[PDB]
Amino acid sequence: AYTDESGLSELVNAAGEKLQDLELMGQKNAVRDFFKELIADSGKVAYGESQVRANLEINSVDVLLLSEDLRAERVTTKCSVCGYENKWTRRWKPPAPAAGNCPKCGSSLEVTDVTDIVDEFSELADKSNAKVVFVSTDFDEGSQLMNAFGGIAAILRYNTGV
Amino acid sequence: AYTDESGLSELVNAAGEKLQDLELMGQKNAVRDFFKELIADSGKVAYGESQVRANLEINSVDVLLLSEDLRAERVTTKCSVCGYENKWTRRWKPPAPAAGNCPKCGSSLEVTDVTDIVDEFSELADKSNAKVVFVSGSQLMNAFGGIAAILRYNTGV
Ligand SMILES: [Zn+2]
Numbered sequence: 001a002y003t004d005e006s007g008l009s010e011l012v013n014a015a016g017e018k019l020q021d022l023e024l025m026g027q028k029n030a031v032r033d034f035f036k037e038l039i040a041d042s043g044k045v046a047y048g049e050s051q052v053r054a055n056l057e058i059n060s061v062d063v064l065l066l067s068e069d070l071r072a073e074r075v076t077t078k079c080s081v082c083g084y085e086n087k088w089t090r091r092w093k094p095p096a097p098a099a100g101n102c103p104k105c106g107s108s109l110e111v112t113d114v115t116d117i118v119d120e121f122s123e124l125a126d127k128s129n130a131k132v133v134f135v136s137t138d139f140d141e142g143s144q145l146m147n148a149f150g151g152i153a154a155i156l157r158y159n160t161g162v
Numbered sequence: 163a164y165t166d167e168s169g170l171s172e173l174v175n176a177a178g179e180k181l182q183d184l185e186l187m188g189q190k191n192a193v194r195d196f197f198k199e200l201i202a203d204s205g206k207v208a209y210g211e212s213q214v215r216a217n218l219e220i221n222s223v224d225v226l227l228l229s230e231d232l233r234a235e236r237v238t239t240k241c242s243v244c245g246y247e248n249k250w251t252r253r254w255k256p257p258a259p260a261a262g263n264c265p266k267c268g269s270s271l272e273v274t275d276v277t278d279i280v281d282e283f284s285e286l287a288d289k290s291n292a293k294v295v296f297v298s299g300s301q302l303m304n305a306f307g308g309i310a311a312i313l314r315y316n317t318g319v
């Protein structure tokens with residue numbers, strides 16, 4: 001009378017849990033494949049916000065790895081008169097990012113967009129047909145991902161050396 | 163190599179959304195009906211751990227409401243000697259209770275059981291075939307303590 005009884009909940013419920021376990025199977029093997037590419041050197045890996053960003057901007061990323069714990073936004077700012085601009089990543093916490101003055105012409109800067117980092121990197125991934133994988137902060141692999149590698153890694157299609 | 167590109171996920175994950183959509187309307191069905199009973203009869207609903215357990219024990223609960231945000235443990239200490247026994251409830255946090263000695267014979271009391279409140283009340287509800295609903299809504303967890311019941315009849319309990 002107030003909750004399912006025909007047992008479709010239990011059915012739909014069933015598949016759902018199995019799929020999750022498939023997820024973590026994919027998330028594990030993926031971190032591991034990043035590791036296996038890293039060890040074998042190759043120069044076919046990359047990790048950290050700055051290093052992984054530049055590869056995405058040249059479509060070199062085969063597989064993109066992001067921790068389920070990434071708490072950080074990318075802030076773009078632009079000068080209201082001259083062509084000055086800058087971007088940078090700030091860890092989000094409870095107001096909003098500010099815009100001071102132009103170090104070029106002294107005019108007031110203004111923030112033109114804020115985007116969580118996981119957004120920007122998925123937009124670029126999608127762009128270059130990179131595969132997008134997420135990694136919960138549970139299994140050690142997915143833990144180290146955030147601990148060491150800034151919670152952003154990647155297996156590359158080729159060695160940019162970058 | 164790392165995901166479900168069969169479309170299977172998309173469907174089930176989505177079907178799991180449609181059915182969660184529904185389960186929630188139902189939980190509003192149940193809380194609304196409890197409050198309506200409370201309004202034509204203050205004796206045909208129950209609320210609170212005390213009145214509700216008393217009513218389930220006597221199989222007079224038509225429908226039972228349990229707040230998902232309920233952290234509590236029912237302790238049972240018996241005397242290792244005389245037939246003494248008590249039952250108290252303890253709000254949940256990160257330990258396990260101890261008994262001490264007996265007010266009757268002075269022997270050692272032992273905690274013979276700890277059972278999740280939701281568990282006991284559930285078993286209690288399975289023997290009378292009462293319909294069990296978990297509510298998260300928060301007017302339950304707060305205004306009444308996350309335990310409430312729509313009786314099948316007025317019990318004076
Ligand atoms: Zn300027």
Ligand SMILES: [Zn+2]
Binds near residue numbers: 242243246267
């Ligand atoms: Zn005793």
